[PDB]
Design a protein around this ligand. Sequence first.
Ligand code: ADP
Ligand code: ADP
Ligand code: ADP
Ligand code: ADP
Ligand code: MG
Ligand code: MG
Ligand code: MG
Ligand code: MG
Lengths: 328, 328, 328, 328
Amino acid sequence: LGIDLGTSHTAVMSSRGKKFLLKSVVGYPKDVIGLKLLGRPYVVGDEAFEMRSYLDIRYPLQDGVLSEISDRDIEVARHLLTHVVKSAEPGPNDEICAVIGVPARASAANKALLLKMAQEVVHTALVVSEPFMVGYGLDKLINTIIVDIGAGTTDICALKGTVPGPEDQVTLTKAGNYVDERLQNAILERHPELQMNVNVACAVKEQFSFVGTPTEVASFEFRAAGKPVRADVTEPVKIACEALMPDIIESIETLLRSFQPEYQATVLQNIVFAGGGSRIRGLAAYVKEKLRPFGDANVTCVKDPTFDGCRGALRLAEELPPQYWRQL
Amino acid sequence: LGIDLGTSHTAVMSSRGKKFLLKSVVGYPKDVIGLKLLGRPYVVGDEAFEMRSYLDIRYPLQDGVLSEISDRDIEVARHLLTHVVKSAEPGPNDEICAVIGVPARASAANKALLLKMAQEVVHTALVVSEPFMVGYGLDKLINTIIVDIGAGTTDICALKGTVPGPEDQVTLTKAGNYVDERLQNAILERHPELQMNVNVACAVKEQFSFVGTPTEVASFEFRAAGKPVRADVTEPVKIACEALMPDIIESIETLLRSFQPEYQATVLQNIVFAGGGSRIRGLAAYVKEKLRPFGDANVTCVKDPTFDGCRGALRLAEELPPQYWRQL
Amino acid sequence: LGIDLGTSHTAVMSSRGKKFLLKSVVGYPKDVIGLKLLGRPYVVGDEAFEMRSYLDIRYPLQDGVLSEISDRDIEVARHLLTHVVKSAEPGPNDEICAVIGVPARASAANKALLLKMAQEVVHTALVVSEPFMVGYGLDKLINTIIVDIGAGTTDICALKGTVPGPEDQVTLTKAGNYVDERLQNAILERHPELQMNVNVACAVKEQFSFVGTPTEVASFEFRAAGKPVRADVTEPVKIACEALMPDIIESIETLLRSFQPEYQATVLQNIVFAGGGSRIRGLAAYVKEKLRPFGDANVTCVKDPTFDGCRGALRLAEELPPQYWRQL
Amino acid sequence: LGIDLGTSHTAVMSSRGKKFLLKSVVGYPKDVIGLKLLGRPYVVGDEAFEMRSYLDIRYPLQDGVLSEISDRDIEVARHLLTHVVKSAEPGPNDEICAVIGVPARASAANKALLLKMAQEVVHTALVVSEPFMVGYGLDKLINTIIVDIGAGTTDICALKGTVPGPEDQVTLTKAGNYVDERLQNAILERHPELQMNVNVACAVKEQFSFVGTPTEVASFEFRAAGKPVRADVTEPVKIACEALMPDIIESIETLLRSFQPEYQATVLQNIVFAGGGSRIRGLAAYVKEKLRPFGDANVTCVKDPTFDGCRGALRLAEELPPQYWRQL
Ligand SMILES: Nc1ncnc2c1ncn2[C@@H]1O[C@H](COP(=O)(O)OP(=O)(O)O)[C@@H](O)[C@H]1O
Ligand SMILES: Nc1ncnc2c1ncn2[C@@H]1O[C@H](COP(=O)(O)OP(=O)(O)O)[C@@H](O)[C@H]1O
Ligand SMILES: Nc1ncnc2c1ncn2[C@@H]1O[C@H](COP(=O)(O)OP(=O)(O)O)[C@@H](O)[C@H]1O
Ligand SMILES: Nc1ncnc2c1ncn2[C@@H]1O[C@H](COP(=O)(O)OP(=O)(O)O)[C@@H](O)[C@H]1O
Ligand SMILES: [Mg+2]
Ligand SMILES: [Mg+2]
Ligand SMILES: [Mg+2]
Ligand SMILES: [Mg+2]
């Protein structure tokens, strides 16, 4: 059971052979109101996004990584597993093991969290990081730089072929949520100084992801009063979003300098952008083109990362020689 | 010039020879109270704590050095410099160079910020990290794992014999602010469900820092309604703060595993704790005593870190051979 | 002036008659820390061994042979010479001549290097093979095969009747350093796979040199992690050290076969072992006893080679007239 | 079965009559990649050159001298045999005897290893030195010193008389590996002080072998930091290999002293140079020309030594009279 548990979607590819491309966020009814009819005993996935105004949303994966459960009872993770795993549970003992995607710098408490749940439910406790699944799934060679841009963290993975873990790699905290804070600051420098929330900032990032080049687009949107309506330009959206590139290429530069000549010379392994970064236009302009410029390596974007994360799930589904399971 | 940035203090050690015990927080007037340009054009220190309800508080440190400057025009930095540096400014044109403490994993954007400030004050921009600044004030031998427990980060950096700088260093995010979040989470799961804020969690941490041992103390504090007042037993304050110790000694263990036999055999040089951590009772119990226990090396607590930060400035005040200034 | 320059010690006896049993290894401070001037411009002796983690210690005697010195200024050897001059400074024209010990197969280029330095410090250059120097100090008869087992090389030299020079003498590269590599090979091919360096392997050899017989000893030492500690057996230390002697007596067999009939009948002339090999227990068992046995010649080990290196200096102080000086 | 076994490449002539110029170095997979002992039962030659970062490489012929295989099972040399010899094995018992090239000064321990391998392949163990292949294949008269300059050994052949095999000959291991050490030290004399590994040192030697004369060439490569690619000059490359020939002709001078009057009078037979050193420009300058000069003897170089190694193997293949094999 290879699951890419992330900040937006939850890509489930079982070993049995079924594909369930489910969604993120877990809530439960904020006050005492209604029975199951109104809400549900915890709400998981798309209905919690649809009812995000009626539920208390308890972070279950802070910064794209298993936290601990802030309710301090392990019920957000329990009802998460109820929705994802129990409702689609194999009825023939398809010898099921569990691989939950973790960020590149995962803690031992996140490993312990997965361990306790694997012992409770009944799954071999395996821990594989998100960019490892990509490097095992997509048939890439060493060294293929993997930049996974989600909402919570930004994983800069460029390990040697031993894949030692968090030794020669760094998980950055500046991600989509950091950009959303800068987008909130960007619209406070406008004339009417709108104060929109994070959900609105996410909508602008999703619909108008034109960061490398000044594509002439605008967000036709309403002001806080509700009657005024105008096309908000993306002049300060470009400025806000392009300020994270320096840190990405600085971490890449620092790592490449410390590697051997054959890992320095990879002007053909490219830099692979996955996640939400694959849907942002103009990220190849900085490295490949003449804009940052950052050397001259080519840049590759993953088409449909949600569908290509199940390839890594399939790769780890077989055969996983028990000897590897004891060693991981 | 040595500036020891911090939440508790922003200490200044001049070349002339004076110690200025200055304080944190920078705001500027959000309303129309007092005068802003003729009274307090930005407010720094204890007056900003005193008037924290009428000022717009735009952090500018975030547990470390230059954060980013949320004004986004060098206005938090400029009026901070006006308060601190221009008030201590030597009048005899003393060969002043700028040494400002940075976190163990400092960025190049922090260096860029230091450079922008160095152009404002025309001084040489020098970059010295805090763990080594402590080992300059307290000249201990190799190697004493200097751990700086502050409000923002927890910097764990062992020392190498040649003292090359922080090449192998750990900066954790779990710090005093993380403890305050856990303290809030603890009292939201109790009988009376206290509704205290972050500053109150910090206040109780400061007044009753008993974590290693169950010393029977109680915090005379107001209940969730606000008028009722009683001696509230600090039972779960010990529990909440206990859970950060594992990570501190895990990073040290990871270093010891990677160290060579010469560096492994250094338990007589002990581990030194500075910052707010050195004012917590029971910190030596885990490592020095027989409670975790963690090995054998003894524990030394820094008394009055403010003074020892000025010792590090004094060490770096002379002679700093221009050749060292070009090389740093 | 006789200098027995080794990897363990540097025995100095002046012409005047004073004994200075000085120490090995030359370093200098590796990164910018402290000041060599304040400490020592290059550090010579056990201070550099004790501070080998603070200093760059570039080998200045690869297997009893001076290196080319990549700095190309010969300042490792000039400060080494200075160290000895500080200990044994000449005053009233101390008829000082330089007796320098060399390995048995030293090249003319190696002698020319020593000659250049002897001309720099104005002294008569007298190149004497180390095995012959031992036979000058400990006056044995012909033919007493002298085997000098050091860290760098193993010098096997039958004493010649008139001692004409390098007629037939052998320098092997397998020595203490080779055995230390085999000790590393032992602990890396065992169950717990201990991770220890050469310095520690040398320490175990020094403290527990029990090779011919299975003396029941154990080395109380820390494991690869560094915290665990236990008494490690010397079963595979005996195996690792066993294979030195076979190669030594292989070369001696070649000498015995090459001897003329009057040199063949020399079983009462025996074989004398010096260096670090004189402090190994069970060495005489291989030859003298009935273990290999290598014939039945008796074995004599040199007691305190450090103290008996000055006896050869005294023998090569006097005499050596204007004909001996022109001859070398 | 005449096998020239080296560290760069091998040369095998079969009884059938085919030339196999196959490559050297043996590893086996250390990281998890493909199948370990099933994808390639130990990895030899060009796949180990291409995949050198995934393999554990354990040399078994340091400087033309068989080691002891530190795995302590002698499986690195046995799988090498199954790679080369078993893959080209006669299927009709083409009377096969094993002729493995040995250094001019081989030990009895090296012969013991040949005997261990001869039991694995069931063939007669024959011991013939490497430069005898050259002197018998390319029939030169007696006595024409042969200097075959390889990576590991530079066997100095001087056909002796009577006694038993090696009477007056010496293996010189001041060879490619020595030059690699000189090159690494010579590029540290540059301004930025390049710090390159052995593979790069070999690459520069192979591409621009200009030593005797100052031919102005340069190699576009990475500097010490390794950011720019610039035409790196060969000023200190000429210096690095300047002290090689002097030491070679030092040994030849010693041979000329040991030669009989008619053996000494062989300047019309010249000195024959082979191996990788035969493709270094300026080789005859030192001896034949007026640069050292070493007298005035003429110099002959072998064209394509790699292709002439099979001619020497063929010469030993036939007829190889059994009476000679019993006597060898
Ligand atoms: N078209 C788009 N342009 C920019 N960002 C997008 C787009 N679609 C989704 N995203 C962003 O992708 C982020 C989710 O991270 P992603 O890696 O795609 O999901 P997961 O973490 O589940 O694998 C969200 O911040 C979301 O706004
Ligand atoms: N007696 C005390 N017990 C516990 N913590 C204290 C005490 N006094 C001060 N502190 C804490 O020390 C912290 C300040 O440490 P400091 O090194 O200035 O932080 P930073 O350098 O990250 O800004 C604050 O969180 C403060 O509450
Ligand atoms: N008690 C001991 N047992 C075994 N070896 C020892 C002992 N004491 C010293 N040695 C070894 O003696 C060696 C020193 O030999 P030395 O003559 O100084 O070397 P070199 O001749 O190469 O200069 C070192 O390898 C050291 O470990
Ligand atoms: N054109 C060249 N110039 C100089 N050296 C070369 C050249 N080509 C190969 N070599 C060197 O020849 C050496 C190997 O020669 P070889 O006779 O195969 O030695 P071995 O038998 O010890 O492997 C290597 O060091 C290689 O770099
Ligand atoms: Mg993800
Ligand atoms: Mg601090
Ligand atoms: Mg010696
Ligand atoms: Mg060869």
